[PDB]
Design a protein around this nucleic acid. Sequence first.
RNA 1: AAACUUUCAACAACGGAUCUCUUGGUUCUCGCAUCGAUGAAGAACGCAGCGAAAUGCGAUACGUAAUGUGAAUUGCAGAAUUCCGUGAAUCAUCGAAUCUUUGAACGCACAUUGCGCCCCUUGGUAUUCCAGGGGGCAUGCCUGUUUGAGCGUCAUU
RNA 2: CGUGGAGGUCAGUGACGAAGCCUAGACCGUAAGGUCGGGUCGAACGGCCUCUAGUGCAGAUCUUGGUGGUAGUAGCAAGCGAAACCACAGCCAAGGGAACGGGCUUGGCAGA
RNA 3: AUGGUGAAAACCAUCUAGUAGCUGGUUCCUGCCGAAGUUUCCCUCAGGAUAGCAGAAGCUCGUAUCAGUUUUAUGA
RNA 4: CACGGACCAAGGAGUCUAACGUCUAUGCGAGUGUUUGGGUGUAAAACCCAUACGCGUAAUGAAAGUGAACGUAGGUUGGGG
RNA 5: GUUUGACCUCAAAUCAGGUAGGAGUACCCGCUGAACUUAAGCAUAUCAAUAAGCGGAGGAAAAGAAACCAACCGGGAUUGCCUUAGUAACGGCGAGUGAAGCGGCAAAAGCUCAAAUUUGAAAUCUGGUACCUUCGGUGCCCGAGUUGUAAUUUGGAGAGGGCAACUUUGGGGCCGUUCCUUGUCUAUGUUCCUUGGAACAGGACGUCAUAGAGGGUGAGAAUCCCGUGUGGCGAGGAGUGCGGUUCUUUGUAAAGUGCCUUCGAAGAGUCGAGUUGUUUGGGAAUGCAGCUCUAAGUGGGUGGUUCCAUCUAAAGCUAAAUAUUGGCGAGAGACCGAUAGCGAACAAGUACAGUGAUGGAAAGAUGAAAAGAACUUUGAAAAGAGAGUGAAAAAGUACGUGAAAUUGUUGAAAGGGAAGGGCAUUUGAUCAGACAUGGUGUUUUGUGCCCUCUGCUCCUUGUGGGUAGGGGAAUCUCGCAU
Lengths: 267, 130, 108, 125
Amino acid sequence: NKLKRQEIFADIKHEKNKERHTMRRKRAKEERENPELREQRLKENVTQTIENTRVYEDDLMRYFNSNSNEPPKIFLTTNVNAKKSAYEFANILIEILPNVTFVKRKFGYKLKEISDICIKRNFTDIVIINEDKKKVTGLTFIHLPEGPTFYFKLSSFVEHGRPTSHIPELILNNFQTRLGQTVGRLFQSILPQNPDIEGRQVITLHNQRDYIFFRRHRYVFKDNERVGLQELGPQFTLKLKRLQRGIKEETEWEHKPEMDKEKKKFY
Amino acid sequence: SVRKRKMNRSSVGKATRRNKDKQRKINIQSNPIIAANWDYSLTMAQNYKKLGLRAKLQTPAGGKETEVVKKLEELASRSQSEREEEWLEKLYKKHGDDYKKMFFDKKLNIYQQSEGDLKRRLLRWKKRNG
Amino acid sequence: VKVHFDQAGKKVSRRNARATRAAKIAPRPLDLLRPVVRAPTVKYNRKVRAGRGFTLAEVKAAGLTAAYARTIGIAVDHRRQNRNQEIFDANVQRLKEYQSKIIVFPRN
Amino acid sequence: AKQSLDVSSDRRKARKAYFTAPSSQRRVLLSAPLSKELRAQYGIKALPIRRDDEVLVVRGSKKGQEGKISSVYRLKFAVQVDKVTKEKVNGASVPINLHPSKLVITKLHLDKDRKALIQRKGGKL
RNA sequence: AAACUUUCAACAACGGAUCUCUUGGUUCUCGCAUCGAUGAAGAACGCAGCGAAAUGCGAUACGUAAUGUGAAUUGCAGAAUUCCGUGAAUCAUCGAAUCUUUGAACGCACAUUGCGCCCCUUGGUAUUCCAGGGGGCAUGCCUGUUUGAGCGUCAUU
RNA sequence: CGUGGAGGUCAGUGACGAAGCCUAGACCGUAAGGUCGGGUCGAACGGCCUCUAGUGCAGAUCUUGGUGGUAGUAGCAAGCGAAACCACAGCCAAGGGAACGGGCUUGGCAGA
RNA sequence: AUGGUGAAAACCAUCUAGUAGCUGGUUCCUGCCGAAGUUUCCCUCAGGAUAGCAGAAGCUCGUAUCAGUUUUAUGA
RNA sequence: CACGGACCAAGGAGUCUAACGUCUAUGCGAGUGUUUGGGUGUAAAACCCAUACGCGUAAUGAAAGUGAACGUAGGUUGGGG
RNA sequence: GUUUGACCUCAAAUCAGGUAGGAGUACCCGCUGAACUUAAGCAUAUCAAUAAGCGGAGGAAAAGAAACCAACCGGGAUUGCCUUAGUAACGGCGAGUGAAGCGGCAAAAGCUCAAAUUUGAAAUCUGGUACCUUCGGUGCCCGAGUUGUAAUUUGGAGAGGGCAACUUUGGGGCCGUUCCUUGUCUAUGUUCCUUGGAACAGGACGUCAUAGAGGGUGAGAAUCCCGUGUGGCGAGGAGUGCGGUUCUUUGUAAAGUGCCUUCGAAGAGUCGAGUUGUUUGGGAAUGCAGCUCUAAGUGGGUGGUUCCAUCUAAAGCUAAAUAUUGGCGAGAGACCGAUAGCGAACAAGUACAGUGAUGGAAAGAUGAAAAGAACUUUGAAAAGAGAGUGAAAAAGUACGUGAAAUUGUUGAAAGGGAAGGGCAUUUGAUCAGACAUGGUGUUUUGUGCCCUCUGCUCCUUGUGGGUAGGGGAAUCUCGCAU
């Protein structure tokens, strides 16, 4: 009986707002006289966000990841028969990564045959960008000896900054999880360990969920406890997958949709 | 409908009757020999031909002895009143076998019955007695 | 405008009616022994059909009585007359054959 | 296949009969199967459900979780198993409406008429 | 140039089309005969811890008793139940009950919640009266029953 | 060629998304329409050989429902707030045979 | 018209989806063929009775079957 | 000229039946038609069928009647093959 | 006896026992009865022995055991279906109206009065009352009733007797069957994997089937639950249909049959007759009513060419076959799917409007579960913002999908008193545009279904198929790998 239901609950919703806030206007008036009474409300009554309700070595550093000892050379390739947007994407990685060589990948040389070349030529990391259609979709960082390999998914790219030739400073956020700090480990390794302070360029890698956002900014310091920053470089969202452990042979995590069911965890 | 609408609406209920199976499978009731020898899977006319007995005595419109002997098996298998007997004793001892005298008699043969009536009843009396 | 949708329904009705009459009148053949009659009118006189009931005359000549005839399941008509000789012969033979077939159960 | 003329295979009649069933008929409609251990002991497949008996949930999100039935909500065709509870945002507890076909009884609550019910259906307590 | 008007596109609005569903309808067939002066159909006034219609019910008032089932009811609140038994239940069945004011409506009446009568009567000595409880008092007609009436007819030393 | 349902068939398609709805998207068919991509969706649906019909809309001063211009106008004897009406627009001259010039033809002209 | 309700001449409900010598409207595509605007009396006025133009099929033939034409021949 | 059109969605109009024909298809054929019915049935289906009846099979007339071979059911002429 | 007593009649009562009204109404039975409309105006024909109104019934009603149809080598109550048949017949022969007997079938069932005396016995019934085994029986009393209640008889005859060395014989319980109502028991996966919130889906592996109808369960479930299918165990009722089990059967009782003898009554203000209306398509006023007169008994009614056939009125009862838009209860559909289908899928004959009779809509869908948004914050309120639940709020009690008209915002484009359309093209914006990669001919080798040694097995005609154990490439491209 929709016609009955419609009036009953509209009036009840109307009744509730009056009662909800008349309680609150009396709350306001008792708070004017006593500040202490407000304090106790904030203790008991909690906002209860998702972050609040989350459902809960040195040899490695060098052996699996690149350190501040050499310049790391990154073998930037593309998936076979890719179009304009992939190379347009390669031009954004040509700036941000330290010593990139772009390799036009011409059919064959399966994967191990590539590894033979980048042992001889002596590269450190391989990065490969792929396209299903006209948009870029996946990004794969591999380390050339041993093979800790990370796969990623891009769902955001939007393009007023125009940066200098100065090398940007790193910053990472929320990697409490050990699987998080092994990805934090990758971006500590793969991006430059130079930071030239002047030039004022900052690269972030914020991870408040399982989604990682990387951005560039320009920071201006005023002595009144505050800093300003303008949007620069590519907009970006990544998703971790796989951790193939060998060059491509093994797995450690491999995202399924069996997660998202928890609404929490966050790896 | 007006009245049916209320009966569906009410919490009284309906006088639900399931009696459609019984309209077909009718039990035979009037003969025990038939009650044992009657295949309910068969029809009426088919049951009659199985038994032997005729189902119809006329030429039927349209188209088309184990038990009967047992019916022939069941086919294989009055006194006078006290006053009447005592009254006949009075007549026999008085006359004997003179039926003419017996029916012209007034005192013992009150209801003026014929010779044939009195002698018939005496024959029945002479069977039960001397 | 009436439509006979119930042609199939009423045949099943009539069949179940005969089935009940069979169940209740167990050894007996549902219908009474009807005579054999010559039809009226020049057009149909060649046809010989099932009549209504016999007669006192046909019943008396067969070797049974009128009141008793009805109890053994012989339909008896009293207004019908025995004008024809051949019809009379055919009906008497029909009854005598019927009397040889019947098996009248005792009342004990 | 339907043989009887008494029973109806109509969807409209059948759905109405179910949704407008009385509490007594809904007792039989809310029957639970017994676990393989009880089926081996008692020699019976399924019984109607009551309060003070234990149960194990087979199908659903609350898979494998067990407990003891609090109340048979016959109106909503549901059981409410204690300790199988969804916690509301205000800190309160609200029981999940489970269906007894999805449940499985682990420990029965034997009364006198319950013992008679088992003995009727070909049981051996 | 902006604004303005118009066109297109995107995102919001407005509206409830389309699709899918369906405790509803319509039609066909089968079976059965079941309203009322023992007061019906219908109208009205009410009744639940908390209720609008609907449904149920009549001061025993969403029921009482009986029989079966065997442990709920649940929109909310609140009681319960000895749960190895005379027993939870807005359960099923239904044969015993009560059954307000009316209505064919029936004490007299017109549209008076007035106007009464008789019987039975527990109480206020109740001999006066006063109050309460309970059942009756319509019309026509039949079978009687009864007290009569009738120069209606006859009998009668 | 298409629509609702029926028989048959495709061991057809289908929560790894049926039907519907859009779409500056693509292909086929002269066309009726059919097929596909993308987006939205949430549960059934389609091709083929046949059957059946309450089967295909621009109109009926059509029926129902919804929404405009009129208009923040008339109005209430800063606020509140219609209705009649509505194919579409509304510069002149001259010709456009036919008591027809308002769309055309040739000119004059024309700034929000 | 039937039956009813109201009232200092009416309305309601059925008969009744009453009857039209008419008004407005009539729902997909393509291909192919394709008019008529009228002869004569029923009188016409109304509706038709027919012939003509456009087809459908069957029968003989496929020809010397004809033609909105020219020519010669023979008259007023 | 005039009547209709503010816009949009949905609804919306040669249907069903009886009587009597037309042509085509199918069955059989001097016959033909089961389904008023009865029997049977896995059940309003399907499958069987008695007796009748319908229409046709042989005509010429007005009350009363008669009746089709001179016959390769004809002689000729044509006449698909 | 100027008392008194029989009856008959009229009364009476708040006596005893009853009963009739009203509702419903589809069907049925009666009564009453239009108009629009059809043939040309309308008196018939025609709407129509209709609709409305009135009265009365039932599960059916009505009808019905011949005062019938026929013309035959006769049929044989009534009702219905098929056919007779669109025939006879009627109709300003025109709109057209429209039977019946026969035949086939469905279903079949017959009987009760009044009629001449029980006269050697009113043999009958009501009611009251007392008991009993209470839809009643019995005793006793009372009344009705001779102005006739019982038995015997109804034309099919029948009765009175006589003769058969004639034949037959009631009723009450008990336990079963049967019928109705109701209760209860009866098979087999929740086995793995994938996907999803959820498995009822896909895949793998099994069982049951007289159960793979249907419905529920978080999506398509024979195998999860209820049922379904075949059976079984009951409880409470009905009952004369019969099976058994008995208890009692009586009285010169009750019939039946054939022969012989003696009798032997059957409906009146009715049939019919004239006439005025109604009824019909009714030609031999058919049927009915009103009014006048009103019969007969070797009779009377109806038909057939001078007879013959056929029934017996003026009294009554009766199932089944048949009708059915109501009621009660089911089972269904090549039906409709929320502007459809009933007016009403929902607080529907409700809200509401009308003085009143009456008229009378709109309005279905959150989810799997309210988990219906806690708590912080903006405002007196109205609504928002953070935050959260859920698979999805891109599902919010304005709640599935969410079309078009139309409205706002943003972006692009165009605009000197018209736009939209067609042919063609430029510019601006924008989308398409191979997980296409070989092919051939030689050469290393390495394997196998290749060579070779040994076999095994299904079958049908040579021109078969499947399938093992060893060896071997120094021959072989026969294939596939490098």
